[PDB]
PDB file of C-alpha atoms in Angstrom:
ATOM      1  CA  UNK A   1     -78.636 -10.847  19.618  1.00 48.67           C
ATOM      2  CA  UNK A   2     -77.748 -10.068  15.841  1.00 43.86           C
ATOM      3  CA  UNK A   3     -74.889  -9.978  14.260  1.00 44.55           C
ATOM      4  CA  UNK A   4     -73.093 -10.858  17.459  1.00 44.03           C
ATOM      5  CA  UNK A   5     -69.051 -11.293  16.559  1.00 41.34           C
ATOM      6  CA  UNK A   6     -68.677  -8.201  14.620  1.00 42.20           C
ATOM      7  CA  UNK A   7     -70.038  -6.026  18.753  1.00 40.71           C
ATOM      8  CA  UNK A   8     -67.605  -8.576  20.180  1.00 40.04           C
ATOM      9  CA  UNK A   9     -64.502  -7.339  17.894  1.00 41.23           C
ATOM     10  CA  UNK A  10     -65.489  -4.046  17.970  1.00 37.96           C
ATOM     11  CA  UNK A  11     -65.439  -4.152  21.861  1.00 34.65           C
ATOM     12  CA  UNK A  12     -62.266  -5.562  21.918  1.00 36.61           C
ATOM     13  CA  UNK A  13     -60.822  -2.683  19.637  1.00 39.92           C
ATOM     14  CA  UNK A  14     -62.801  -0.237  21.853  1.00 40.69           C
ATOM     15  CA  UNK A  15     -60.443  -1.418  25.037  1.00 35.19           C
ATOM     16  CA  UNK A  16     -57.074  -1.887  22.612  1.00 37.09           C
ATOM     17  CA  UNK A  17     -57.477   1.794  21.998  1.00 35.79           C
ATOM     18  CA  UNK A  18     -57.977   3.097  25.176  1.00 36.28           C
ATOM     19  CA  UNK A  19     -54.815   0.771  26.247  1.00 33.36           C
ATOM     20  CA  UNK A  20     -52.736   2.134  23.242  1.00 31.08           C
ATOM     21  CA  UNK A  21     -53.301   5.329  24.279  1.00 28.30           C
ATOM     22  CA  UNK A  22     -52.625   4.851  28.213  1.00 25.92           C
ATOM     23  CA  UNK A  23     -48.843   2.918  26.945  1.00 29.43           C
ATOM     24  CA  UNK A  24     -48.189   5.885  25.074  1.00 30.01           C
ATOM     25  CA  UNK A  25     -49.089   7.739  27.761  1.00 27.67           C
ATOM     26  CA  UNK A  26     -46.327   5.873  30.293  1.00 30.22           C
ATOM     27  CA  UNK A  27     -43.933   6.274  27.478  1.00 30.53           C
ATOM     28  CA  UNK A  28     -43.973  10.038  27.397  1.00 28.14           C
ATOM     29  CA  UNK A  29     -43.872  10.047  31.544  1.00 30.88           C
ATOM     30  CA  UNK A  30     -41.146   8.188  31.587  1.00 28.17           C
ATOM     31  CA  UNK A  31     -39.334  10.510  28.906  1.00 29.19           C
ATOM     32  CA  UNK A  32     -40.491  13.927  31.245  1.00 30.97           C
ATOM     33  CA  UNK A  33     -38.813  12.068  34.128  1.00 30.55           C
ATOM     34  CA  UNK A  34     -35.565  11.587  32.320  1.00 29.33           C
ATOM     35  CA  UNK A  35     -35.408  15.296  30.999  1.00 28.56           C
ATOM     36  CA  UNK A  36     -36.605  16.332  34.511  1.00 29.18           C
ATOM     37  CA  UNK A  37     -33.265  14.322  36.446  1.00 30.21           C
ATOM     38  CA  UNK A  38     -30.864  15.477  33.456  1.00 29.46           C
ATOM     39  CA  UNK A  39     -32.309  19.272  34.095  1.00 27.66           C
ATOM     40  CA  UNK A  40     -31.695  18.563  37.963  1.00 27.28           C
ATOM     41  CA  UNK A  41     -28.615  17.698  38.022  1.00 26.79           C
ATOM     42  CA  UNK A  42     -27.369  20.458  35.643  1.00 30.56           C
ATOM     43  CA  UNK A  43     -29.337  23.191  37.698  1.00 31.80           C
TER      44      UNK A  43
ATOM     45  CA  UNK B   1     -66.874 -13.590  12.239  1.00 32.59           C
ATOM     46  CA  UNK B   2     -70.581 -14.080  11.336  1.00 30.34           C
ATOM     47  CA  UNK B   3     -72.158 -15.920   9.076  1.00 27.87           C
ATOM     48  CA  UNK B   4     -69.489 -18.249   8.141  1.00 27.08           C
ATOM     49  CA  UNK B   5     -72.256 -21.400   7.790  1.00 28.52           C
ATOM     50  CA  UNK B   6     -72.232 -24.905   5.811  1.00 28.05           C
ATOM     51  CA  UNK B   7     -75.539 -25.938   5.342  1.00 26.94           C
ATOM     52  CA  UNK B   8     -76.550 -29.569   5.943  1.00 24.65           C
ATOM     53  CA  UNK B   9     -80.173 -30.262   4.724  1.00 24.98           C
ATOM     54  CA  UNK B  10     -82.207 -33.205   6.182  1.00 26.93           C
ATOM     55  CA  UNK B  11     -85.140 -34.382   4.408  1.00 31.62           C
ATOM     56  CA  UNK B  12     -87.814 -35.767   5.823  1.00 29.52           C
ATOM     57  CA  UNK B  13     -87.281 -40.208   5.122  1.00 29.44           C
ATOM     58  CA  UNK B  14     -90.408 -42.373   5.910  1.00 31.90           C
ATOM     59  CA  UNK B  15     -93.320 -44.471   4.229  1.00 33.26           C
ATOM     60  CA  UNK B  16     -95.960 -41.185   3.260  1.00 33.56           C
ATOM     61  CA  UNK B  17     -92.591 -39.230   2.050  1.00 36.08           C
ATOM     62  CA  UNK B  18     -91.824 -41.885  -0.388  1.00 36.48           C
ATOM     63  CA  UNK B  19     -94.718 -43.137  -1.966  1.00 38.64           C
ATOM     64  CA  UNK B  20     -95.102 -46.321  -0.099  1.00 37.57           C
ATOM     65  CA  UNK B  21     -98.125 -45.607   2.143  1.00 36.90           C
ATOM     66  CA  UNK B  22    -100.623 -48.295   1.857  1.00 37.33           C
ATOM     67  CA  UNK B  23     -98.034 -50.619  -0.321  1.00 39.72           C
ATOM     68  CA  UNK B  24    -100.517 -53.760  -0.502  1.00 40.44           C
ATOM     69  CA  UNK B  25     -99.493 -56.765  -3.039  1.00 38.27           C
ATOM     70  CA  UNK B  26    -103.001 -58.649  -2.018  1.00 39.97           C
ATOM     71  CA  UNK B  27    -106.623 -58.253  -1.562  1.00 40.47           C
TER      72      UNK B  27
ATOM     73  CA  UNK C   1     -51.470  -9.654  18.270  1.00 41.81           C
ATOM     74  CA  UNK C   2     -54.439  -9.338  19.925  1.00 41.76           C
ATOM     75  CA  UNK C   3     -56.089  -9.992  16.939  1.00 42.90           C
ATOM     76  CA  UNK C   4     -53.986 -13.312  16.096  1.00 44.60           C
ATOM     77  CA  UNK C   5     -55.197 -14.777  19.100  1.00 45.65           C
ATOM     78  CA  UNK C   6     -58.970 -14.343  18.966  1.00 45.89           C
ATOM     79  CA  UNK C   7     -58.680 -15.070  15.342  1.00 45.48           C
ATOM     80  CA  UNK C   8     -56.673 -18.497  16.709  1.00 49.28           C
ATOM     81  CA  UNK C   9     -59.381 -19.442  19.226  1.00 50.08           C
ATOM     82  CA  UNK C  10     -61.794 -18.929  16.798  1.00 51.61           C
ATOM     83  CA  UNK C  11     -60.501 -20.917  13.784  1.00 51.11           C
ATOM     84  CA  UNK C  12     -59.936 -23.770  16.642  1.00 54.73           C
ATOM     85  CA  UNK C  13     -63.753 -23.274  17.793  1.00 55.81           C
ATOM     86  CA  UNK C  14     -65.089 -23.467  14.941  1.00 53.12           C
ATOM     87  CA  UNK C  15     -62.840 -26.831  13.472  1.00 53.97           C
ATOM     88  CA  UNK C  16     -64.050 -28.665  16.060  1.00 55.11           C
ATOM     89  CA  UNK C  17     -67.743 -27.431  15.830  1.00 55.85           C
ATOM     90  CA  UNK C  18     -67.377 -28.747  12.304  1.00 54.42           C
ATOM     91  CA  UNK C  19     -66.537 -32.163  13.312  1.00 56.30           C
ATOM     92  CA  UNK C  20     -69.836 -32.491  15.168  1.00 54.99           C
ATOM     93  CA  UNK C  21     -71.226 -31.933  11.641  1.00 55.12           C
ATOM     94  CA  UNK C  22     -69.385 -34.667  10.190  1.00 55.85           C
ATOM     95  CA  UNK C  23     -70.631 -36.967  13.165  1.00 50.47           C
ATOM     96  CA  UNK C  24     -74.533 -35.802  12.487  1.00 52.14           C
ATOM     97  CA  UNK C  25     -73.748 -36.793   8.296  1.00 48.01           C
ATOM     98  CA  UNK C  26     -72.368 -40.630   9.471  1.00 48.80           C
ATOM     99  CA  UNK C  27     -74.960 -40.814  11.680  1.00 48.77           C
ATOM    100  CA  UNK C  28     -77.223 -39.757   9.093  1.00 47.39           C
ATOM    101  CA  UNK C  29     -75.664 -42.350   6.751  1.00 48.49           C
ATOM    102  CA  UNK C  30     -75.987 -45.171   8.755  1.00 50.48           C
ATOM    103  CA  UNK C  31     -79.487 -44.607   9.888  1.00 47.81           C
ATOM    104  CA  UNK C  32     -80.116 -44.151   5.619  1.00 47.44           C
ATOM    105  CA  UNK C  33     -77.875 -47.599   5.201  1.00 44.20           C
ATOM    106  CA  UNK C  34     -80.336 -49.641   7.364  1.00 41.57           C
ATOM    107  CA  UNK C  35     -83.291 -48.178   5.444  1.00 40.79           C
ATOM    108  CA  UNK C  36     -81.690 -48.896   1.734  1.00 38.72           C
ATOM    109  CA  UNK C  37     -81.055 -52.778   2.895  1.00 42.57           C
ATOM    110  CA  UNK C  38     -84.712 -52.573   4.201  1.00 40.75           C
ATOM    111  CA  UNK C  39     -85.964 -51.399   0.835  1.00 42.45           C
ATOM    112  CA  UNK C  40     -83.898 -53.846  -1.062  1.00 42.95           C
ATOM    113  CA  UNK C  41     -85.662 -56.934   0.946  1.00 40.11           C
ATOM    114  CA  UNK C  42     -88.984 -55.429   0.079  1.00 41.06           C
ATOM    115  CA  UNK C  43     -88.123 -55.266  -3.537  1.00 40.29           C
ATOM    116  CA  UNK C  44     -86.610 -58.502  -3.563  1.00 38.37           C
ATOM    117  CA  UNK C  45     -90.319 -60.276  -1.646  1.00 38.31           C
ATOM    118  CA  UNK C  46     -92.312 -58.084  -4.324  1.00 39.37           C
ATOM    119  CA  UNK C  47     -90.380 -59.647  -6.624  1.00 41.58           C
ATOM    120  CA  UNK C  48     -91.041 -63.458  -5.365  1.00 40.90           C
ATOM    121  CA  UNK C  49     -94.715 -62.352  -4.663  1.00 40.73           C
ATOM    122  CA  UNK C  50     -95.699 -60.971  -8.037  1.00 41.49           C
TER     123      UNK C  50
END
């Protein structure tokens, strides 16, 4: 194989973005369940 | 990352390499 | 952070790859000791022979 380190670091960028954008995901989850109790408890 | 060599060279040390093949001080 | 640490194990790798190198060059130097004190003797018996 050439040039082998530079395929290894971009594979490990290649999964660091897709887990980037899953924790953003659980961030923004967590913030819909919080404005969904708040909206609850109000209704 | 790649490429990221020191370079040893190795030459090749014995009696045709340095001149002394058939080194004779008689007859 | 994920970065630091493959950047860390590499650095480390490749330290103690170097160290092999510096074995092969004393190994290298000995082996090219043996032949100088060789070479010496010869000069010194072409010296006494001529």
């Amino acid at each position: 194989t050439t040039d082998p380190l530079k395929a290894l670091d971009d594979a490990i960028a290649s999964v660091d973005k897709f887990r980037s954008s899953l924790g953003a995901v659980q961030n923004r989850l967590d913030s819909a369940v919080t404005n969904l109790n708040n909206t609850t408890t109000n209704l | 990352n790649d490429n990221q060599t020191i370079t040893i060279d190795l030459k090749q040390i014995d009696a045709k390499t340095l001149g002394l093949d058939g080194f004779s001080v008689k007859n | 952070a994920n970065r630091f640490t493959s950047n860390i194990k590499g650095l480390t790798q490749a330290a103690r790859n170097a160290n092999d190198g510096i074995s092969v060059a004393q190994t290298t130097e000995g082996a090219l000791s043996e032949i100088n004190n060789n070479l010496q003797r010869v000069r010194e018996l072409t010296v006494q022979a001529t």
